Design a protein around this ligand. Structure first.
Ligand SMILES: OC[C@H]1O[C@@](CO)(O[C@H]2O[C@H](CO)[C@@H](O)[C@H](O)[C@H]2O)[C@@H](O)[C@@H]1O
Length: 229
RNA sequence: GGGAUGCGUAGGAUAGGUGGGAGCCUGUGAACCCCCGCCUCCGGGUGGGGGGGAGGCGCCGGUGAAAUACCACCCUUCCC
């Protein structure tokens, strides 16, 4: 009946809204802000000094988190020839060709990432572009999700190679681990995401790039942080 | 500083963006009834209050370009 439940209201008292925390402080506090009945994902949020309306100020990139995402990633790989066996033995959850394209086309969605070899991307683009596109699941050499080293790509994605892309309002968000992680490992992951983010600052972007940065848990409150700590 | 606002069509119906998400809320009072302010696309929405006394919400499915609880950073148009 209030705006929040007693669980959440108990967490809110544990943060200081006026304080900008160091990354090390946030990394250590995060265990206290995670009281859901599952292992909560830790998230980093940044309000960016860009104009999201212009293409040359988009922020899009990937980063390999030093200590991963802390969760299984079901990877569907679309390949042909010897690469099918490569994808299989590299541990992709699903490996198919023409027929798996068909299956996705009819609304099968039970996977977390899609990767593909180049020599199948023609078909994947035309047929699946419409259905994976507006969900960001379409494989693409930009995101490291397309290549003939399909084995290596599957292992990199299982190891928590994330993509990040600002939203139309000028904010950006990413998962960076689990609240059960050791704090130093969380800190490593946070700093790595911030590092990758800053490396994608647009040349013509005006003013401070990271206008604000926050760390939070899946169902908990947030703490504002100093990205340069 | 504080508080509102977000509805083509289809779809429970009022779906602003993205990210997180498989759980969330509830005798620390669910459903439901009633009163008031605000907002309204006139469907309802939202905030508070008076009662009530045990169940709600999400997920899956379905519709859809997008799916919904809960949580985070934001944006639009406004008010005190
Ligand atoms: O998106 C697939 C993956 O995400 C989860 C939550 O982590 O489900 C989310 O995405 C679904 C696909 O649209 C939504 O329907 C669902 O409501 C949302 O939580 C997982 O359940 C799923 O494996």
């Amino acid at each position: 009946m209030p705006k929040h439940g007693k669980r959440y209201r108990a967490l809110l008292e544990k943060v200081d809204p006026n304080k900008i925390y160091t990354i090390d402080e946030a990394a250590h506090l995060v265990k206290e802000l995670a009281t859901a009945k599952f292992d909560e994902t830790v998230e980093v949020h940044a309000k960016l000094g860009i104009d999201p309306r212009r293409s040359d100020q988009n922020v899009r990139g990937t980063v390999s988190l030093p200590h991963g995402l802390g969760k299984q990633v079901r990877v569907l790989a679309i390949a042909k020839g010897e690469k099918i066996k490569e994808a299989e033995e590299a541990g992709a959850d699903y490996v198919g060709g023409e027929e798996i394209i068909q299956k996705i086309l009819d609304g099968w969605m039970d996977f977390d990432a899609v990767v593909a070899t180049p020599d199948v991307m023609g078909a994947v683009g035309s047929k699946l572009g419409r259905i994976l596109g507006p969900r960001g699941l379409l494989p693409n050499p930009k995101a490291g999700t397309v290549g003939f080293n399909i084995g290596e790509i599957i292992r990199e994605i299982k190891a928590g190679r994330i993509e990040f892309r600002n939203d139309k309002t000028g904010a950006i968000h990413a998962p960076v681990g689990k609240a059960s992680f050791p704090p130093e490992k969380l800190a490593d992951n946070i700093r790595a995401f911030i590092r990758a983010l800053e490396a994608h600052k647009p040349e013509g972007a005006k003013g401070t790039f990271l206008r604000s940065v926050y760390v939070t848990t899946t169902l908990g409150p947030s703490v504002r942080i100093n990205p340069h700590s």
